[PDB]
Design a protein around this ligand. Structure first.
Ligand SMILES: [Hg+2]
Ligand SMILES: [Hg+2]
Ligand SMILES: [Hg+2]
Ligand SMILES: [Hg+2]
Ligand SMILES: [Zn+2]
Ligand SMILES: [Zn+2]
Ligand SMILES: [Zn+2]
Ligand SMILES: [Zn+2]
Ligand SMILES: [Zn+2]
Ligand SMILES: [Zn+2]
Ligand SMILES: [Zn+2]
Ligand SMILES: [Zn+2]
Lengths: 283, 283
């Protein structure tokens, strides 16, 4: 078990595609296609992304007294718009050459690029999927989503069965349109979750209940009333009002409260809680 | 003195430009220019903006246990990108027809549109400026910025002095480029403040000091230690640890803490504070 610098590591893993920009060729073979710029965009985009996460990981600042966490959700929302753009672009291209011009990508150009493209993008996407699973990173999930579209690469266009015996036409249209609807949807949902962490949305009901249970069960407390929750990137923010006994000394009240705090802090490691203690002046 | 529904009001004041879409003409005079679509975009854009602020104004939710405030800063950041786009578009157009083609907007077409355009946009921008001043609205400031670019309308192109006596050329280039640099800068700064409220950035040093003064001055408190601050839209979030005397009854400690809270609350109305009280277990 390493730490959230696991996400730091994926960010360069995106810059693995640095070798893919070199696994392009002009001096090796004087021929040019378009997927040398998509992967030049990638270097920039996901290099920015590395910088943004590196900002995201900084601890409490002078003028960021809470996290820098949100940087991730911004970075997400940024990417989700750009990925949501490329996907409408490719869905409208899906109905565009629904053989309105014609299946034109016929040049059997050295497809050893697009098969290698798959193979090293496949490699990335899974390392990415591994970190997404290990650490819930908003930021890396978005950067993955794009590469998940790049994995939608078609050196899987039929050449023997090919198109289809004329009358019932076939081209990229069915696939290039299909990916478009799914990835638009996928980026759209992705973004919606980003803005939703940017609004200070509450924790999942599950986590919320755990907190309620931890608290109400506890020896010292009698009631607990105001419970607000949110997370910025990894770290989650929890506040609550605990209702201890009116006549308790403060040092004692603070003890029960410190414990309840300390409990919540074991259960959601990384978290930041703050307990207001009330006596009995609540109906 | 009305309330933050003052911003609600500007949102329709943007939809005042609904009459400007009708103050266009095809059936009155069969002639067409481009500034009928810029103001059709306006209806949509700033209508969305009205909805987003109206969302922004909702009180504490089930799954937004803090504000909906941030909606504004999102809405800002949204607009700042789109306004930051139109401004690079117009700066690159500024060096584009630096008489590379030629001063082509020669048709003395019924400019009674662009003068009226000024006059009712001028009207808006000032009502907008009035609310921006009255209520610091992130959201309305952005929506204003665009109209501030629309106020940069040139029925102030010289026709008598005109261009200039040939050898020392003159066109829109000097103005259309000039606006471009300023508004790009203006939208870029605008956005940066948006993301900066989206990161949970601290209150201005001034406001932060007022809180420190309010607290440390207070009778009951001995020290105060952890102070975190931020605002989402209008409402500002404040938390602090107060150090009361170890042996105090809770009901008493809560009283001093309640007053300190109540003080901060008078000084920054709308605010939301939360006080953790500690005894003496701090060095
Ligand atoms: Hg590889
Ligand atoms: Hg009690
Ligand atoms: Hg008007
Ligand atoms: Hg003390
Ligand atoms: Zn790519
Ligand atoms: Zn900082
Ligand atoms: Zn309470
Ligand atoms: Zn209280
Ligand atoms: Zn406009
Ligand atoms: Zn809500
Ligand atoms: Zn403390
Ligand atoms: Zn404490």
């Amino acid at each position: 078990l390493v730490s959230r610098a696991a996400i730091a590591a994926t960010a360069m893993a995106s810059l693995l595609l640095l070798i893919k920009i070199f696994a392009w060729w002009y001096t090796g073979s004087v021929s040019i296609l378009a997927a040398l710029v998509d992967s030049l965009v990638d270097i920039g985009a996901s290099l920015t992304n590395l910088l943004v996460v590196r900002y995201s990981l900084q601890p409490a600042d002078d003028n960021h007294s809470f996290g820098h966490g949100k940087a991730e959700s911004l970075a997400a929302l940024a990417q989700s718009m750009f990925i949501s753009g490329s996907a409408l672009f490719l869905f409208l291209t899906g109905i565009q050459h629904l053989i309105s011009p014609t299946p034109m990508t016929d040049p059997g150009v050295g497809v050893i690029v697009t098969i290698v493209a798959l193979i090293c993008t496949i490699i990335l996407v899974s390392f990415q999927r591994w970190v997404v699973r290990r650490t819930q990173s908003q930021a890396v999930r978005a950067d993955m989503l794009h590469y998940q579209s790049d994995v939608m690469m078609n050196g899987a266009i039929l050449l023997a069965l090919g198109l289809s015996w004329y009358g019932w036409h076939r081209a990229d249209a069915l696939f290039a349109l299909g990916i478009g609807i799914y990835i638009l949807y996928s980026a759209l949902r992705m973004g919606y979750e980003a803005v939703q962490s940017l609004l200070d949305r509450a924790l999942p009901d599950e986590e919320r209940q755990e907190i309620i249970d931890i608290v109400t069960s506890w020896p010292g407390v009698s009631g607990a009333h105001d419970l607000r929750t949110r997370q910025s990137g990894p770290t989650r923010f929890i506040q609550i009002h605990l209702e201890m006994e009116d006549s308790l000394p403060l040092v004692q009240a603070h003890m029960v409260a410190d414990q309840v705090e300390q409990a919540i802090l074991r259960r959601f490691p990384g978290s930041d809680v703050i307990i207001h203690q009330d006596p009995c002046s609540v109906v």
